[PDB]
Amino acid sequence: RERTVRLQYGSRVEAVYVLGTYLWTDVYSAAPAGAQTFSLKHSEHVWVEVVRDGEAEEVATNGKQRWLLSPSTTLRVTMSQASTEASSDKVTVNYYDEEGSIPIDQAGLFLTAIEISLDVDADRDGVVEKNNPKKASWTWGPEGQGAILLVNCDRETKEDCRDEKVYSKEDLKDMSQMILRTKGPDRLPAGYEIVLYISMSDSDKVGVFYVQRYIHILGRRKLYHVVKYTGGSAELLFFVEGLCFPDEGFSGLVSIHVSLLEYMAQDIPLTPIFTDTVIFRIAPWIMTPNILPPVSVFVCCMKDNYLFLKEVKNLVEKTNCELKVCFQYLNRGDRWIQDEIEFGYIEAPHKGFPVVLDSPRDGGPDFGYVSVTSLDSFGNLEVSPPVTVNGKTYPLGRILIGSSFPLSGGRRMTKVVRDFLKAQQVQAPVELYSDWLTVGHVDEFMSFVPIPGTKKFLLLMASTSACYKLFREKQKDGHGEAIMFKGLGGMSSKRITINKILSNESLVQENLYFQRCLDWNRDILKKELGLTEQDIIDLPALFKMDEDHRARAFFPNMVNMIVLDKDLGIPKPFGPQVEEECCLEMHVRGLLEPLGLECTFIDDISAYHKFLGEVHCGTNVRRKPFTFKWWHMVPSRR
């Protein structure tokens, strides 16, 4: 970076020189009228070149050499080390007339060299390197560069980013470090100051603190901060926090600048002499698919649903997971832990923590927080395992959300949430068709499970055709009078049997139609996830149709299951009993067990004595993040 500094006719010029720049110096304007040639002297630590029409020659500290004065003959001035109190850094130019070798005038440049660098960890190893040449840019990929910021959604005691205040030093651990490194003499020369600043636009995206006492110096309603200069080699440590996630209209990128400003006069703005810039990207909110290792199983249910709690506890005891049990709240649905909460995470090189998206129906440390229809529930939000589709890899998987057909006039998840998920970018969301379901959640018809002992996975699909095939076989086998819902006393008077199901003509037509809805989804998943029929297992399911021609479960949907590695908690179907075993249970075992999946059926409905299509319990599994670092992905240009 070349910077212009002119000698003044005939007055001396004093200037700060910032290392990493060099000066081009006009000596011609300061020459008195009539002068012919010029000579120069300079001090030890100042390098000077005479540049005549593009050709440069280094000049000695004390030479007698003379050059013709000319607009195209200039100086180039460089310094490789900062000034100290022992420095006298200068260049002095003498001017000569045609007649005689004694100088007729003199112009000089007194310099104070300083190092100024605003530094961040742009190489993404968690430590702040000195002046990374790439620090002003942000690039994706394994070779990518530039610093990362976490949204500080934490709380120690709204969330931590809600204000401009910092209390716990623990908070600073969530924060990215930014260091202003300087070197120079005891003070800046008269008329200079160093100022950190941000744009008005980024002022709601960031906050910056300086440390027993943490001062908030940039952020909401603070766009600049004058920095105190310390001489010698000094470092000022700053901590930077993100205030919000990428979204519609916010890419995730923010910038912080430091400038050396020169005081000109009263009422004149100060001149930026030198500016250094660092860029941060705020880390996206990321979702964890069923293939990732489980950590904690969160469950909600009424206090007296005893079988559910015993059977969930038993399942979890087969694993290394912890069980967290939560009951119902006045402001939350019976399923709220599944529907109102989604466990994601954020990651930076230095730190990461799980982060919960919380969407209450009505209404900690390193667990972060944050017209409507049923499709806005997080039962309607899933994510696939890592996939490759037509050569394009999605190392974090793809987010799936249920919707309706474009021209249908049907329900759709709110634009605000869809925009949020799309803006995270690294999960490249796909819309499925959930609006044929009364509740409208993708988790009603589909799930993913890992295949034990491999790196592969399966898509599990609800299938009505599988159920009808099975029931027709059992009927052919002489089991037509086999009764469903055994043990649910509130269903007993209905006397529902395989015969009674198979003879219901309108129910058959309804379920053929629902199977078309399932198959439409099957095709989208196969296309957008790069799946073949070998990656899919069909689980028998059955639905009843409402007045809107939407489906609700006839018996509990087995596809919505707790996946803990090889161990699966599967909703107990209460299917027809053949030889004192549920034919639905036996059929599901026959599909899954050969692959090394272990099935545990979990009864969440007995406590209610009947099943009308609604489940009153919910579960959500919190998982370890992907090993793959999000910043190593190269998302498509948006």
**121 is a site residue for Ca ion (CB under 5 A):** yes
Contact (CB, 8 A) for 92 and 41: yes
Q: What is the dihedral of CA 7, 9, 11, 12, to 10 degrees?
A: 10
Q: Considering the rule CB under 5 A, would residue 336 count as an interface residue with Ca ion?
A: no
Verify binding: residue 604, Ca ion, rule CB under 5 A.
Answer: no
Residue 223 three-state SS: coil
The least CB distance from residue 368 to a second copy, in Å, is: 28
Min dist. Cβ of residue 105 to a second copy (A)? 13
- When CB distances are held under 5 to 8 angstroms depending on the partner's kind, the choice from Ca ion, a second copy, none that residue 241 binds is none
Q: Which stretch binds Ca ion (CB under 5 A): 110-118, 150-158, 190-198, 321-329?
A: 150-158
The item of Ca ion, a second copy, none sharing an interface with residue 121, based on CB under 5 to 8 Å by kind, is Ca ion
- Catalytic site residue from 300, 301, 583, 617: 617
The residues binding a second copy (CB under 8 A) are 1-4, 6, 8-9, 24, 26, 28-29, 32-34, 51, 53-54, 71, 74, 195, 197, 199, 223-224, 249, 251, 257, 259, 261, 264, 267-272, 404-410, 465-466, 468-469, 472-473, 475-476, 512-513, 515-516, 519-520, 522-523, 526-527, 532-534, 538, 549, 637-638
Q: Is 17 in the site for Ca ion (CB under 5 A)?
A: no
Does 358 help bind Ca ion (rule: CB under 5 A)?
Answer: no
Query: What single letter denotes the amino acid at residue 432?
Result: L
- Is residue 227 part of an annotated ligand binding site? no
Angle at 475 between CA 605 and CA 499, to 5 degrees: 60
Torsion, Cα 621 625 626 630, to 10 degrees, reads: 130
H helices within 398-504, ranges in order?
415-424, 442-445, 464-474, 498-502
Task: Clarify whether 326 is annotated catalytic.
Answer: no
419 is in an annotated binding site: no
Q: Which 164-203 residues touch Ca ion, going by CB under 5 A?
A: 165, 171, 174
Q: For the CB of residue 55, give the shortest distance to a second copy in the complex, in Å.
A: 11
Q: Is 339 in the site for Ca ion (CB under 5 A)?
A: no
- The answer to whether the annotation marks 127 as part of a ligand binding site is yes
Q: Which of 155, 171, 323 is nearest to 240 (CA)?
A: 171
- Please name which of 61, 110, 109, 114 lies closest in space to residue 84, comparing C-alpha atoms: 114
Contacted by 466, from a second copy, Ca ion, none: CB < 5 to 8 Å by type? a second copy
Angle ∠(365,370,372) on CA atoms, nearest 5:
150
Nearer to a second copy, 70 or 492 (CB): 70
Q: How far is the CB of 31 from a second copy (least distance, A)?
A: 8
Q: Is 344 or 576 the residue whose CB approaches a second copy more closely?
A: 576
Q: Is 123 a binder of Ca ion (CB under 5 A)?
A: yes
97 class by beta-carbon count within 10 Å (0-12 exposed, 13-18 middle, 19+ buried) = middle
- The CA–CA distances, whole Å, from 590 to 133, 539, 585, 587, 593 equal 60, 11, 9, 5, 6
CA end-to-end span of the chain: 32
Is 592 a known ligand-binding residue? Answer: no
Q: Report residue 532 as tokens.
A: 């073949």
Q: Which of 49, 119, 154, 202 binds Ca ion (CB under 5 A)?
A: 154
Interface of this chain with Ca ion, residues 370 to 429, rule: CB under 5 A: 378, 381
Q: Give Dmax (Cα) for the chain.
A: 128
Q: Which is nearer to Ca ion, 378 or 485 (CB)?
A: 378
Secondary structure E strands in 317-398: 322-326, 341-347, 352-358, 368-369, 381-383, 387-389, 392-394
| Interface with Ca ion (CB under 5 A) | 121, 123, 125, 127, 129, 152, 154, 160, 163, 165, 171, 174, 366, 378, 381
List, by residue number, the catalytic residues: 617
